[PDB]
Amino acid sequence: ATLEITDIALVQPSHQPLSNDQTLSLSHLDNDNNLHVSFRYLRVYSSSSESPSAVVSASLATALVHYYPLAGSLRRSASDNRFELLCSAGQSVPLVNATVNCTLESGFVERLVPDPTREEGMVNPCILQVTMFQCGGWVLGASIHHAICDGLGASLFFNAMAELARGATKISIEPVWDRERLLGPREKPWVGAPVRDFLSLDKDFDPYGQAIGDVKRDCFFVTDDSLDQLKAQLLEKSGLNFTTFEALGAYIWRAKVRAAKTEEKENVKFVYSINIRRLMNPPLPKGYWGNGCVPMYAQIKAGELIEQPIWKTAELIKQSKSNTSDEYVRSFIDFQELHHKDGINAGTGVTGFTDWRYLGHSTIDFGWGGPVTVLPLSNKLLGSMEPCFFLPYSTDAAAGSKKDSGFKVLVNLRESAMPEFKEAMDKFHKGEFALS
Amino acid sequence: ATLEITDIALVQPSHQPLSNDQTLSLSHLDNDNNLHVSFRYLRVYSSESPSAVVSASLATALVHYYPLAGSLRRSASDNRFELLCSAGQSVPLVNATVNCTLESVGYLDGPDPGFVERLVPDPTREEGMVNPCILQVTMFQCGGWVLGASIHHAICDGLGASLFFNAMAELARGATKISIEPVWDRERLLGPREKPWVGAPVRDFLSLDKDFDPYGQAIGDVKRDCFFVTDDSLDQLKAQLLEKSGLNFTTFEALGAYIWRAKVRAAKTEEKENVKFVYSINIRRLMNPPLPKGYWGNGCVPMYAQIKAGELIEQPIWKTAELIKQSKSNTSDEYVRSFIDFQELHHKDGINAGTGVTGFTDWRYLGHSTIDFGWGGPVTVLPLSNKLLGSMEPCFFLPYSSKKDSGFKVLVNLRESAMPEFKEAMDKFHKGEFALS
Ligand SMILES: [Ca+2]
Ligand SMILES: [Ca+2]
């Protein structure tokens, strides 16, 4: 199957917002070395019948009046090498227009969004692609440098585009910058034990350059039935209540570390991102589209994770959220202020988890409805080379039987570990959870 | 205007990667006799000095890409090249000025103002082996500049060269380390099979003649010209082909067919002469297992469509477009392995695709814009080499600098006697007079 790039549109703001150049500063959350990555993902749309490309391009043009920094260039500052965003009149967001001879089925998927290096993504930190499928339907791909925004910030931007596409006269929320005012370090930096216990310094360590072999991607459908069984059996054995994220998180984390044959005394970490916009005092505004999340962690020696009961692991994950506070965030920022040059990292053995089940995927509607499927292609996230995603429920899941209902889990895992991991997921599917 | 050379810097790696000498083996893809050419390419930038920035980034890039500083020589057992690297080797950087503005010329996107050839070194045969990588920075009197490169095609393909230039550019932008570490391993990854075997796809394309020089044919002097083609006119052509044939063609297929026909027509190629449409495809991701990400050696193979000239010039464009489309069907792991094993079996026997080969290269959607040393991506890119793909008349699709005005550039190399008819063909194309049938 041949994907043909018909053209690349350089889409400028409808009305140029700048006189002369502006250099925007980024926050210490934005400048985290673990966010120096392009994040690549796509949305699949059902109907193709003006064209999706015409609608997306015109709406991008209008949105860029307020969101013009996405048209900018990331560069290192003159002083501390942290990134800033150079904005100037004439800059654009590239929209790649493509067409393939295929069916949405929802190797080749890699060609649906551009794949810049972290350094290349500095030059072009927001690239979109509209790919038309001959058989019906289309894909919106996005490659966004993670320093510019988190998922919530990208959702503000895309929702602004989408509401304009649906005929809004103006965007309903003015995007806020103010990044240094809102998330700048304290005058006397202070870093508490919860952040210090998590992070270490090593100028010689690249979290995304570890020699673990080729990282493979696989997808597993996990049934609601299986998860109800897991949670009920954990309750019967422990007296304790666990969420899907805690229980399935624990099972996958154990399986992966077991499958990788991690040394017994290696410290391993379960890491996830939490939105702190409303947690800060004072809170970040709704229109704050920069990174407004911090990583939270649970940590344990690998030998203990692989042989302790799942209810203990699930309880560690549950209890991780208790570190989430205004101070945790301030501590995290202050640590970046003190040690950005010193190679801040969470070490080897980090498994990142991202839960996309409970987000408003469906408001990103350009006229063809909400996406039928959403897929992240990136495998470098949260200081992990092996991140896991819980993907949203499809509409077919709510239309179908209870015993058919479930969601896909996308796993990134080193090739050598994948055979055993697949076996662990097959046992899961069979309800052979081996909980203790 | 007048171009003058101010000095020539010999840039060594910032830190010596070599204590001990080494001879690097090249692949059978690298040692293909059609790749015995210095590939010459220039990037134009509007605007410490560019020369300073380029020079330092080169020096740091050579820590990892030091074989570009080495010398090609023939091995002791066969006439195949190997690469001698040793401490002290350097990449020459030519520093130059020209006394006119980039603005005054087309940002070199119009006709040659008379010095375009002097913007990139043009090494002789022996010079290009001694110095298989040479750069040049030419400053224009109003501050803009051109980066020229002469790189021996045996060392790398376009994707390899792009790896290298992107390494220089990201270091110039203050990277703390390069994004992709380059991988050698050429012998192990792209060496021949112990029992060489060559399939019909490769055999049907290639022949043996120790007496034939694909780049020394007596066709007259080859000229270069450029044509702007609008996205509109391609849409029209594709819609007409679909209407008449029931087949959807890519731009490369449709425009490829049109240009190929027009060229063979204009050359008055004899009726029963076999003519070929040849292009290079990247096989890094096709191989089983795939080549690694930083494989910067040649990782492409030539694909072909062939047909008699008499049939090409009189059959419908849609038939020709289908021929080009169908040529991708040969692209497989075994096609590559067949190609490599043929080079093993017959390197000394003058492997060739014969007369009447027209090469096509589609460089529209390379990552041109990331080759940014701090003055932005290049405003104009220009290949000057015209000995490619066993053709003396290669054609490039290149990016250009409203929907009615949107498009790209076509750079054509064509013998002088055939240029006037070919010009009339591209004018008809521009007016939507495609004469398809
Ligand atoms: Ca610590
Ligand atoms: Ca033959």
Author numbering:
A (entry chain A): 2 to 50, 56 to 112, 122 to 451
B (entry chain B): 2 to 48, 56 to 409, 416 to 451
From the paper:
In coumarin biosynthesis, a BAHD acyltransferase-family enzyme COSY was recently discovered to accelerate coumarin formation as the only known BAHD enzyme to catalyze an intramolecular acyl transfer reaction. To understand the mechanistic basis for the unconventional activity of COSY as a BAHD-family enzyme, we present several crystal structures of A. thaliana COSY (AtCOSY) in its apo and various ligand-bound forms. The AtCOSY active site is located at the interface between the two pseudo-symmetric domains, and features the conserved catalytic residues, His161 and Trp371, stemming from the N- and C-terminal domains, respectively.
To investigate the molecular basis for the unique catalytic activity of COSY, we first obtained the apo structure of AtCOSY at 1.9 Å resolution. Additionally, we observed a single Ca2+ ion that binds to the linker loop region and is coordinated by the main-chain carbonyl oxygens of Arg211 and Leu214 residues. Since we observed binding of a Ca2+ ion in the AtCOSY structure, we tested whether the coumarin synthase activity may be dependent upon Ca2+ or other divalent metals. Nevertheless, we observed no significant difference in coumarin synthase activity whether or not Ca2+ is present in the assay buffer. Similarly, addition of Zn2+, Ni2+, Mn2+, Co2+, Fe2+ or Cu2+ to the assay buffer had little impact on the coumarin synthase activity, suggesting the observed calcium-binding site may be an artifact of crystallization. We noticed a similar backbone fold and consistent positioning of most of the active-site-lining residues in these predicted structures compared to the solved apo-structure of AtCOSY.
